[PDB]
């Protein structure tokens, strides 16, 4: 038999996932970055203005 | 293991090949496991080189060695009065030429002043350009190495010369400019005639002596066909 | 921890006691035990992966000749045949090490048992460090040793070092007596071609991926920080081109890849023996640790058709009463002094001289043993 | 990772966004090898990892 | 594929390593141009395909 | 193993025997 070995042959299958491709869809959501300081500033002002 | 040694490949012993007795001890360091040209002395005995009869055959004194590379002296085929086989017809395999001692070629590139040789790595002092042969020999023996004017032979009446040593352990070399020293090595050659000498050596050279003993074919083989020496 | 070595007869004034403040200093002796536990774990994993117990004190190696057929003829006869054999031998050394401790009666009258238990624990730690240093010397120290075994002297060898019998021929590879596994990179920084050269020093003897040999590269962080940069077809240090990618182990931090199938093939297994694997490059599994000194690469082959074992043999004394670490009652046993001894005997050597290689990364000159593992440099790591 | 940065530095790693971050297109990133960081560390909201 | 080799030759396929070989990172969103071989041909050990 | 070829009649002195170190060389032919 073929006795060949490598770090691959002895190793483990990769833990691969798929990114958001942004392809083969009709629409792509607007990328809307919002940090926790912004959510607090929005929510606090909304509470103060009520 | 490092080495092959010469052996008979084909040897019959009912043709012209014969049993005899050794007239003298074989020197295990110099003559065992080698192709020796042999003759017969004034008794019935085998002797290395020309005896009374001249060269009459070839002999290989086959001797075992220990793993340390040295040979047992307790053998029953190598002392005076021991029996030995001698071949006139046959084949020898793992063949090599047989040479005794060491030999060096000396050539002087200088036409001025003096040049420097070494003996086992310690220097001659000075050799002039254009020496006699005896002056060259004298400069070799004059080293405080404990070698003497019987350990060496020198011949040459030209810028070229040659040193012949009967010992195995003296290395002649060059150390200065103006001179070179080549050790005259000897290897088997394919398709070559070989000759047994009065020394007992075997060499592709024939001189004022040298009966024919055979020819090689491929260099590792000798086809033995001795043309016995004659009055 | 601190490199201070108090040596003497323990007197009063060498006593440790509860402070007037009520701090029991004798509670604190074993407080380092978790920083010691990491060094202990690292030495345990290296020792069990680099060593085997010697059961046969002297090992033989042989060289055998060959023969050939020839073409037949209808009237002649072919040439004869014979085999010449020769043999060589190699062993493992054995040396003796000891320590004393000694107390005055005024110490023994007032000492807390925990102070002397702490000294005993420091001796066991020094014993383990002695064993580790001598195992690592057997691998790194380039020089041949001599030893007497059953009333005859033997050579005790490292890996190939230009001394002893040449390696045997394998396929078309032939070696002379100068052949060495202690080579240098010939450049100031590690290349991918250095990892390929170090790999060739094992594969030249048939110890190879194709024969089923597995490969471990042990390296300092100073080298693995460079090896992590190696990418197939990309130009590298000293103008080398990488033949492979460095492939990270599944314990490395996450990364984005140009393709939703990330790799062709698998990631390396995260542990080799007990050692933590960072990744792989070509056929090397890569482990980083600074028990390998900076500027040194150690490549070790395991398994395969030639059955490569662990490279260093540990020899203990043949008598079971001389084996292990032992406590001997002292010459002073009464008053005003008491003393006693600790003793161990062991020694080291290499059987399978081609199964590993070491590369020092430098521009020029011969391999140097790192002083940390040169034989004469002491008894601690 | 491997791209040049501020003050001529090279990033040794990617920034990996956590699960709460917006689905956003990136060059040279069709797949992720390994995990996304958990969305919270203690009570704090984690934007990603490096 | 498309990279110049020795003597100005340009490869029209990728070297595809066999399952026993050490692993590689896929360079592009496009797969390698070729098919991955079986690890043996008859009884011989296969390093890859081209 | 070594590329050397002994060709000829096997005489005495071509014998392999237990050495002075006690190694039985004839056990090692399969090596």
UniProtKB/TrEMBL annotation, chain A:
Residue numbers of the full-length protein present here: 2 to 51 of 102
Which gene name does the record give?
4
Name the source organism. Answer: Mycobacterium phage Patience
- The entry's protein name is Capsid accessory protein
**Top-rank taxon, per record:** Viruses
Q: Where is this region: Disordered?
A: 1-20
Ranges of compositional bias, category Polar residues: 1-11
Automatic annotation (TrEMBL), chain B:
From what superkingdom does this record's organism come? Viruses
Q: What is this protein called?
A: Minor capsid protein
Species this protein is from: Mycobacterium phage Patience
Tell me what gene encodes this: 22
Automatic annotation (TrEMBL), chain F:
The organism's place on the tree of life at top rank: Viruses
Protein name as catalogued: Capsid protein
Q: Which organism is it from?
A: Mycobacterium phage Patience
Gene from which the chain derives: 23
Q: In terms of the whole protein, what range is present?
A: 20 to 50 of 400
